[PDB]
Design a protein around this ligand. Structure first.
Ligand SMILES: Nc1nc2c(ncn2[C@@H]2O[C@H](COP(=O)(O)OP(=O)(O)NP(=O)(O)O)[C@@H](O)[C@H]2O)c(=O)[nH]1
Ligand SMILES: [Mg+2]
Lengths: 140, 173
């Protein structure tokens, strides 16, 4: 019995099927590229087909990289959920009652939780760091 | 699939423990709500992307613990924010008084031109309301800061609050 960790695994499953659909368009796209190189030898019909292929290849490249992050995001969101729960259980005790080994691992979960949240933020930032160069690339 | 966005805005929620900072974030980002009170451990954030005028903005909404034991943790995250919502409880006078100290926490640790917005949450409980809308409004005007009464419980105005917050960040920079 689960709760809106259900939303997490459905989204995960969706992203993996989206990665698989991209790795097949990537194989398809690269099979065409070798076809048009040999057709290099009107040629306007094939010159614009290879033009479309360049854009298409670049889109799948940008899209794969983003999907891979979205999958790391949900794995971190799941780890955060487990750490947060673990920490709360250790906080149910009153601090007089916890001996020194409690505080050490209670401290440890809290820092691990803060570190999981930091990598969530590093992924958010990296999404912009790659969004900022994509408009430097789309300036053409 | 892929989510393409125009700008990224970092937001912060701050205010006394209990005023409803986490429930507001839950209402806005996940469209849920809980009557259980679970104190925020340190900080957390959630994403929501919004359509404002021409553009798609991605809102990283940081949620801070209101308990003083975490203030040193929570003040790290003031600096890199574009926007900071100060939340108080309509049924608690002392939480509205303490708005002033949270504003001084902003001036101490935030960036000089951070955007600011005042929110009196829990408008639902008309019975035990104590802080009058006009006293708060009056306070907020002539800081040049906007103001709104919300209820995360029944959802009143919470999108408006976050949308207004986005508007004023876009005017700037
Ligand atoms: N009636 C009503 N109760 C609300 C509303 N928003 C929050 N609450 C209640 O107020 C309590 C505190 O909410 P919570 O979001 O946990 O507060 P907080 O500001 O995050 N506290 P902290 O700083 O400790 O994390 C919750 O039990 C919740 O049910 C609201 O709009 N109306
Ligand atoms: Mg909370």
């Amino acid at each position: 019995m689960k709760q809106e960790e259900l939303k997490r695994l459905y989204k995960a499953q969706a992203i993996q099927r989206q990665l698989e659909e991209v790795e097949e368009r990537q194989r398809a796209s690269e099979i065409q590229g070798v076809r048009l190189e040999k057709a290099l030898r009107d040629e306007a019909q094939l010159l614009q087909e290879w033009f479309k292929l360049v854009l298409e290849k670049n889109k799948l490249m940008r899209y794969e990289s983003e999907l891979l992050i979205m999958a790391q995001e949900l794995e971190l969101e799941d780890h955060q959920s487990r750490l947060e729960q673990k920490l709360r259980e250790k906080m149910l005790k009153e601090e007089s009652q916890k001996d020194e080994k409690d505080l050490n691992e209670e401290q440890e979960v809290f820092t691990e939780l803060m570190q999981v949240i930091e990598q969530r933020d590093k992924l958010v930032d990296s999404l912009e760091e790659q969004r900022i160069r994509e408009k430097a690339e789309d300036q053409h | 699939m892929a989510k393409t966005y125009d700008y990224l805005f970092k937001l912060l929620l701050i205010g006394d423990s209990g005023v409803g900072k986490s429930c507001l974030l839950l209402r806005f980002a996940d469209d849920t709500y809980t009557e259980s009170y679970i104190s925020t451990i340190g900080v957390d954030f959630k994403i929501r992307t919004i359509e404002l005028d021409g553009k798609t903005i991605k809102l990283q909404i940081w949620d801070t613990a209101g308990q003083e034991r975490f203030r040193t943790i929570t003040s790290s995250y003031y600096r890199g924010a574009h926007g900071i919502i100060v939340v108080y409880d309509v049924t608690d006078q002392e939480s509205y008084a303490n708005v002033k100290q949270w504003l001084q926490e902003i001036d101490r640790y935030a960036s000089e031109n951070v955007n600011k917005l005042l929110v009196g949450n829990k408008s639902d409980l008309t019975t035990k309301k104590v802080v009058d809308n006009t006293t708060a409004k009056e306070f907020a005007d002539s800081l040049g800061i906007p103001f709104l009464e919300t209820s995360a419980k029944n959802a009143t105005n919470v999108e408006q609050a976050f949308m207004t917050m986005a508007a004023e960040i876009k005017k700037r920079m």
